[PDB]
Design a binder for these strands. Structure first.
Lengths: 106, 95, 84, 89, 83, 93, 105, 89
DNA sequence: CTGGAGAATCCCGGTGCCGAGGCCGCTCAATTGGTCGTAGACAGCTCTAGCACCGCTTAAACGCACGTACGCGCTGTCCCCCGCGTTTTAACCGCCAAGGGGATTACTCCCTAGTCTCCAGGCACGTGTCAGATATATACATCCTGT
DNA sequence: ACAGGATGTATATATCTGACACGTGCCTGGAGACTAGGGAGTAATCCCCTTGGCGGTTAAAACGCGGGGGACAGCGCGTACGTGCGTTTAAGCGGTGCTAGAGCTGTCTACGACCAATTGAGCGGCCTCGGCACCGGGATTCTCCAG
C-alpha cells in the first residue's frame, strides 16, 4: 500500500521522524505522546520560520542573496522575545548589535 | 603629519569591527598559549588550528560581551573609562 | 631552530589588539591596568573551561581536542556557541 | 544537520535567497540546543506532576512556560491547528 | 468578593527591614515603589509559572512543592519546604 | 531615643542576626489570591505555600539588594537608586 | 543474614535510595556499579563537611540543636562550597554577618 | 527526608547534637538538588561522549566538573575507599 | 558651530574563482500495521484542611513633627593613554614533506538491567520530657550627651 | 575627640510547656543471586591533517614623539528620609463550624514501545558557474583643521 509522510499530514517540511527519534533517544520520559513530535516540531518550525524570514530580509538589506551569520545576529537580537529566549548564547562570526550609549555618541 | 582626532579612531573601529567579525588576537601566539597551558595535562597533545580559531571566537566574543557589561557598569558609574574593579564586579555577579 | 619553548605567550594578546577587541565591544577609553588584567581574567576563564575540556579529553583518552570538546565544555558553564 | 530543511523553509519564504555554510551550522546548533532545552523542561514537567509520558499537554505547558507572549500563543495556534489537521489527516 | 490594595501588603517598613537584612544603609523614597514594581513583575512571573504548572496538572490547589518547582524553573531553588 | 542612623545599623545587626520572616501572612496571602484570580476558577491555596512564597520573596529581595548594594558601593555612593536594580535586571536577564 | 550496600561499603548514606532515584530518574540506559557507591561517598563527604561547620556554628550559639541558620552559615562560610552554591536560597537561614568595609564606621 | 541518615552521620560528627525538622528538610532538598545536578551532568557526559552507560568513571568526571579542587580530590579518596571495601565485600 | 578639504568606504564599472548549489548514486530513517502491557482519565466517596465566621488587644502598619545628612554638579589637576609612522620578525602566506593518532572494523569480554523473594531497616504515628519558650532581673556593649 | 550614663541586648537564673526524641506496629524497599542480553573496551589497521620543515612578503608588534582628556577629589548647595511616639487598623489571638475537594480506590479504555518489513526521502560525494572577492576609480560619506 502507498504511504504519505507524517510530516505532510501537517503540511510541514521538518522531520517529525528525526525530532521524534531524538526525543525518544534523549532520555526525557518513559513514553512519548503522539502530539509531542507534531506539536513540538510545529512550534520549533514556526519559530524557525520567524528567524529564517528575518535573516532573509536582513540579508536582502545589503542586496546580497546569501545569508551570513551577521544577519542572524541582527535578526535574532532585535526581537525582544527571542533575545530573552537566547540571551546567554553567542553567535559565532556574527558579532553584536550596534548599541552605543547616548552619552558615548559624539 | 596627518592625525585623526582623539576618539574618532575608536568609533571608526567600533562601527567597522561591528560590521566585520574577524578575530583580533594574533593567531599563532594565542594558539601557542593554548598549547603551552595545555602541556601540563597530557603527553603529546596536538591541536587543530581551526579548533583554536573557534576557541578564539568564543574567547574573544566572551571578552566582548563581558566588556559590554563592564562598560554599562562604568557608564552606570557615570564614567567612560572602564577599570579592572568593574570587571571584578562583573565576575563577582556572574560567579 | 625557531622552537617555541613555552614562555610569555600570554603576552601574545597585545595592547592594540586588546584596544581593537574593546572597540568591537564598544569600549571607548581604556586604562593601562585593563590590558594585563584582561590577560589574567582571560587566562583564568580559559583555564577553567579548557580544563574541563581536557577532562572530557582524558575520558576519551585522546591527544587531539576536537571542536565538540569545546562545545561541551562551554555548555558545562552554560556558554553554548552556535556554528560548531 | 537540518540543512535541507532550512533550505525547504528558506525557499518557501524566500525562493531566491541562499545561506552561508557557517550560518547553516549556526542554525543546526540552534535547533539542537533549543531542542535539548525544551525537551529537558518537558522532562522536569513530567517529574513535577509524576507523569511518565510527554504528550501535547507537556509540550503546550512547556511552550507556555518557556516562550513569551505572541510567539507562544500563536505557536499554540499553529501547533494545535496542526494537531487538529493530524486528527483529520 | 473583589480584593483591592494588596500592593500595600508588601509594606514599606517590611521593605526597610529586608533592606537592612540586605545590607542597605540609606533608602530613597523611589526605592519602595521601584521595589513594588520590579518585585511585583518578578513575583507575577514566578507565581504565574506556578499557576501554569497547576493548570497543567488539572488541580485546583497550589501546593508549596509547586512553589518550589516554580523557583527551580528560574534557577532560584529554595530549601525548607519539601523535596 | 536615637539620633539618625543608629537604629538602621541595629536593624542590620538584629535582622542579619535573626532569621524570621518580616511580612504579615494574611495581606501577602490576599495578594497571592488576588493576582491568582485571573487564570483558573475555584483555586485553593496552602498556607505553607504562602509561607514558601514569603520566604522566597523576602530572601530574594535580601540577596538581590545585596548585589544592588555591591553596585551602589561600587559606584562610590551610600544610597541605592533604581538604576542599580535596573542593572541587576539586565545582568540577570 | 543480608546487609545494606552502604555498610558493606562502610557507608551510612543509602546506596539503595540514590541508586533508586538514578534508575527511575531517566538519565541513562544503564548506570555503572561504581556510580552509586561513588556518588554516595561524595554525598557523605559533603555532609560531613557541612555538619562539622554547622556543629561549630551551633557551638558558637551555645546550642545542641541544629536550626536552618546553622546550615546557612555552614554553606555560605565555606568559600568553595559557598561560591559553588552562591545562587541557592535557604528558608529561615538569614545571611552571613557581612557588612562592606566602607559601611562600617 | 534524609532524617535518619543525616542523623547517623550527625551522630558520627557530633554525638550530643540534635537538629530541627525544617533544617532536615533543607538537607533533603540540598542532597536531592546536588544529586540532580550530578545526575544531569553525568547524563550529558555519557551522551555527549556517545556512551549509554554512566559509571564511576563518568561520575568521576562529573565530580571533577562540579566539585572544585581538593573537595573533588577527597571525593576521589572517599570513592576510592568506598569502592575498595565494596569490591572486597 | 558651521564648513570646505581630504580620506575610507560604498558604489559604480570590470575581472575570475570556487564554494554553493545543483546532480547523481546510496542507503536508512521514516512509515504502516500490528501486538502487548500498562499509564492515566474517570467513577465513587471521603476526611484533611480549606472556606467561612466572631470578638477584643495590640502588633503592626501609618501618620505627623523634627532634624540631619545625602547625591551630584562644577571647576580644577594631572597623568597616561591615544595617535601615528617606522622598524622589525616571525606572523602570514605560499609550499614541501612524515607519520601521529583519529577513526574504523573486528572480537570478545564483561557489565548492568531486570525479577522475585525476603525481611529488617525504616516508615507513620503515638507519647513524655527537657530544650527552649518564657519570665525576670541585670551586667555588659554602645551611643550619646555633655566635657 | 573623651567617657560614663542609659538603654538595648545578651546574660543569669528559674519555671513551664510542647516539639523533639524515642518507643511501638507494621511493611516495602533494598539486597542476593542468577539470568540475559549487549555496551564498550581493545588490537591493529588506514590515512587526514597536523606537524615539521623552507622561503618570500609584509602584517603587525614595538617603539618613539607629541599632547588631549578622563578618573578623581574637594566643596558647597539643597534636598528628603529616618526616628520617635501616638493613633488606628485589622491581623493576631484563639476559637468556631461543616464539609469541599484532595486524595484514595476501583474501574475501563487507549497508546506507545517495539519489531519487522518497506521505501522513497535524505545523505555524501562530485561537478558546474555566477555571487562575490577583488580591482580601480568616482560618488558618497565621514572626519577634520579654520572663520
Amino acid at each position: 500500500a502507498k504511504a504519505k509522510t507524517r510530516s505532510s499530514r501537517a503540511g510541514l517540511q521538518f522531520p517529525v521522524g528525526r525530532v521524534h527519534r531524538l526525543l525518544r533517544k534523549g532520555n526525557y520520559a518513559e513514553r512519548v505522546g503522539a502530539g509531542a513530535p507534531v506539536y513540538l516540531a510545529a512550534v520549533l518550525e514556526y519559530l524557525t520560520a520567524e528567524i529564517l524570514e528575518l535573516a532573509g530580509n536582513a540579508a536582502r538589506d545589503n542586496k546580497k542573496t546569501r545569508i551570513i551569520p551577521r544577519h542572524l545576529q541582527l535578526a535574532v537580537r532585535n526581537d525582544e522575545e527571542l533575545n530573552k529566549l537566547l540571551g546567554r548564547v553567542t553567535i559565532a562570526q556574527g558579532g553584536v548589535l550596534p548599541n552605543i550609549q547616548s552619552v558615548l555618541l559624539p | 603629519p596627518h592625525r585623526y582626532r582623539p576618539g574618532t579612531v575608536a568609533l571608526r573601529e567600533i562601527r567597522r569591527y561591528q560590521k566585520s567579525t574577524e578575530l583580533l588576537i594574533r593567531k599563532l601566539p594565542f594558539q601557542r598559549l593554548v598549547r603551552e597551558i595545555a602541556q601540563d595535562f597530557k603527553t603529546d597533545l596536538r591541536f587543530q588550528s581551526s579548533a583554536v580559531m573557534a576557541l578564539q571566537e568564543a574567547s574573544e566574543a566572551y571578552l566582548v560581551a563581558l566588556f559590554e557589561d563592564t562598560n554599562l557598569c562604568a557608564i552606570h558609574a557615570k564614567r567612560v573609562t572602564i577599570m579592572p574593579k568593574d570587571i571584578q564586579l562583573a565576575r563577582r555577579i556572574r560567579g | 631552530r625557531h622552537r617555541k619553548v613555552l614562555r610569555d605567550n600570554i603576552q601574545g594578546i597585545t595592547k592594540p589588539a586588546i584596544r581593537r577587541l574593546a572597540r568591537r565591544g564598544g569600549v571607548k577609553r581604556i586604562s593601562g591596568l585593563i590590558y594585563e588584567e584582561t590577560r589574567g581574567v582571560l587566562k583564568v576563564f580559559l583555564e577553567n573551561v579548557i580544563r574541563d575540556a581536557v577532562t572530557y579529553t582524558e575520558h576519551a583518552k585522546r591527544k587531539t581536542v576536537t571542536a565538540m570538546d569545546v562545545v561541551y565544555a562551554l555548555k558545562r558553564q552554560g556558554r553554548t556557541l552556535y556554528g560548531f | 544537520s537540518y540543512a535541507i530543511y532550512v533550505y525547504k523553509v528558506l525557499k518557501q519564504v524566500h525562493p531566491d535567497t541562499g545561506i552561508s555554510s557557517k550560518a547553516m551550522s549556526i542554525m543546526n546548533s540552534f535547533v539542537n540546543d533549543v531542542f535539548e532545552r525544551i525537551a529537558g523542561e518537558a522532562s522536569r514537567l513530567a517529574h513535577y506532576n509524576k507523569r511518565s509520558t510527554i504528550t501535547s499537554r507537556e509540550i503546550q505547558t512547556a511552550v507556555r512556560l518557556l516562550l513569551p507572549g505572541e510567539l507562544a500563543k500563536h505557536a499554540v495556534s499553529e501547533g494545535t491547528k496542526a494537531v487538529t489537521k493530524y486528527t483529520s489527516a
